[PDB]
Amino acid sequence: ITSVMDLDKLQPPINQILPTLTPILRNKHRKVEVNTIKFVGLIGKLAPTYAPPKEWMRICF
Amino acid sequence: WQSKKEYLSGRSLLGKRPFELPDIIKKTNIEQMRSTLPEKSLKEASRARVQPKMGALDLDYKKLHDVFFKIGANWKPDH
Amino acid sequence: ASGFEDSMQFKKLTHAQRTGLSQIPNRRFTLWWSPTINRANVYVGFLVQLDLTGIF
Amino acid sequence: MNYLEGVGSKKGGGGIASESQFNLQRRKEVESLLSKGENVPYTFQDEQVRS
Amino acid sequence: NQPTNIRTTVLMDFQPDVCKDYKQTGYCGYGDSCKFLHSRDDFKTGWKLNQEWNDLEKIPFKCTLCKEDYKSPVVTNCGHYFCGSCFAKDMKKGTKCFICHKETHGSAKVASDLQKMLNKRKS
Ligand SMILES: [Mg+2]
Ligand SMILES: [Zn+2]
Ligand SMILES: [Zn+2]
Ligand SMILES: [Zn+2]
């Protein structure tokens, strides 16, 4: 939905989505880690400006 | 060849010095910011992953670019 | 809850994480019974309103 | 009233640390024991009498 | 059957129960046991992405050469503006803008659009 639809008009919005994903990266398994890392990297491309840079550093770890 | 020694064997290699950055690069000041030659409790490290801390190097981007391009354009190794 | 407990994590849990009890089932019990457990008819008690809600 | 339990946590950061980090710690201490604590110097350091 | 005649003052509850470690970091030490919310909100697009690694008036009215009113005005391939006497004199020395230092090539338009926007009546 996110890649297809415009970011600005996403309902949740993005700035509320991204901090919900960072604790999901700790979810082990694979289906979650794979599908998440593709979602987080999407936002790195499309909307980098939302989460503050100390949030991107919490993801890099 | 004809040496059973394996080409590189110690006697000279015992005393080889670690590495010296070329002088032009050493101008970029990195030598001071990260001291490699020659600390953090494991608890304090795991606290850094969660916090984290920003602006560790304080390197200047304009200076780095010029060393390779503007100032060190024609810099070529000595020998 | 009997389903998925095994695979949470293994080595990683901190003492509280591993030993302590989850508040999550009690919260489920007090949501389901909320309108009795929270009712205005009470003998003695004082009204408060939550910050941004209209819930007393 | 969950104080009945008796576990707790400090309010700082994110605890356990990563298995790779434990090995680095454990292989330094093992080389401290067997070494009997001596500092074996680097070859370039320009010579604390050694054992 | 709450009594008929009573006014009870609402007392706001201002304390949110948000867990301050999980709000900031996204990791809470206590885990599923934590007595608080864990809800994780973040601010509002504060940051502007500028990379160091890689009715505005832009028209000065008095000249950059005369420092006087534009007379016989001049346009370049920029938005530069000069007097007919101005621009001709700069090329006697300078190759480029008195401002950009881009290539003018001595190219100068009659700038009447200036006199327009320097009219009170525009065009
Ligand atoms: Mg305590
Ligand atoms: Zn918590
Ligand atoms: Zn002039
Ligand atoms: Zn110009």
Side-chain angles (χ1 to χ4, degrees), chain A:
Chain A
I1 296 164
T2 296
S3 64
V4 156
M5 186 170 176
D6 187 2
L7 292 170
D8 188 10
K9 303 307 293 166
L10 281 178
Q11 196 61 263
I14 296 92
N15 61 35
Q16 184 170 346
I17 293 167
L18 187 155
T20 57
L21 277 57
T22 64
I24 298 171
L25 289 168
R26 292 182 296 105
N27 202 30
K28 194 174 67 158
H29 298 289
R30 57 173 304 283
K31 188 182 294 293
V32 178
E33 289 174 355
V34 179
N35 296 342
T36 302
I37 292 171
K38 291 176 181 183
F39 193 91
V40 172
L42 174 64
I43 291 168
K45 293 172 182 292
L46 273 61
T49 59
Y50 294 142
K54 286 163 70 71
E55 183 73 10
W56 295 110
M57 194 57 66
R58 291 178 186 88
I59 294 172
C60 291
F61 291 139

Side-chain angles (χ1 to χ4, degrees), chain E residues 19-22 28-31 34-38:
Chain E
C19 176
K20 189 157 171 297
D21 193 356
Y22 185 85
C28 182
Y30 288 88
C34 188
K35 182 174 70 168
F36 290 163
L37 185 37
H38 261 190

Side-chain angles (χ1 to χ4, degrees), chain B:
Chain B
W1 67 285
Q2 81 191 344
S3 273
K4 306 92 100 42
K5 250 316 78 115
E6 246 209 10
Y7 166 40
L8 273 183
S9 293
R11 280 296 185 172
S12 175
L13 303 173
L14 284 165
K16 71 168 299 189
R17 346 216 33 41
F19 188 49
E20 212 227 295
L21 261 152
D23 55 38
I24 299 303
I25 288 166
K26 185 179 296 182
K27 196 170 303 308
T28 55
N29 205 26
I30 285 101
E31 184 180 22
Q32 293 178 339
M33 302 313 298
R34 293 293 297 276
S35 294
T36 57
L37 282 78
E39 185 277 335
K40 288 293 185 75
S41 61
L42 194 51
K43 165 148 77 204
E44 190 63 17
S46 65
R47 179 170 295 164
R49 291 180 310 95
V50 140
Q51 198 55 57
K53 177 66 188 314
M54 297 298 291
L57 287 183
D58 192 8
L59 238 37
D60 193 18
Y61 301 104
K62 267 81 163 42
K63 194 147 299 107
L64 290 180
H65 178 278
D66 294 347
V67 165
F68 288 103
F69 297 134
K70 192 178 68 55
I71 287 183
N74 294 129
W75 181 83
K76 192 170 71 51
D78 295 14
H79 182 211

Side-chain angles (χ1 to χ4, degrees), chain C residues 12-49:
Chain C
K12 250 48 165 286
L13 308 339
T14 275
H15 187 8
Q17 185 78 252
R18 169 195 172 80
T19 300
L21 59 84
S22 61
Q23 297 288 100
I24 199 71
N26 292 281
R27 295 179 182 177
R28 105 152 158 228
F29 182 82
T30 58
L31 235 192
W32 178 252
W33 297 99
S34 63
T36 55
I37 293 174
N38 180 36
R39 58 185 290 185
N41 206 30
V42 66
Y43 177 72
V44 293
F46 62 95
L47 280 199
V48 302
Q49 178 175 347

Side-chain angles (χ1 to χ4, degrees), chain D residues 17-31:
Chain D
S18 16
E19 155 44 14
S20 69
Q21 280 300 310
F22 285 156
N23 286 356
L24 285 179
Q25 176 158 270
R26 164 198 310 190
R27 291 176 56 256
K28 286 188 178 67
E29 293 181 0
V30 181
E31 292 180 345

Side-chain angles (χ1 to χ4, degrees), chain E residues 76-80 82 96-104:
Chain E
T76 60
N77 289 338
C78 305
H80 276 319
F82 301 97
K96 289 179 179 176
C97 308
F98 181 79
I99 301 171
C100 284
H101 304 288
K102 291 176 183 177
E103 292 175 9
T104 57

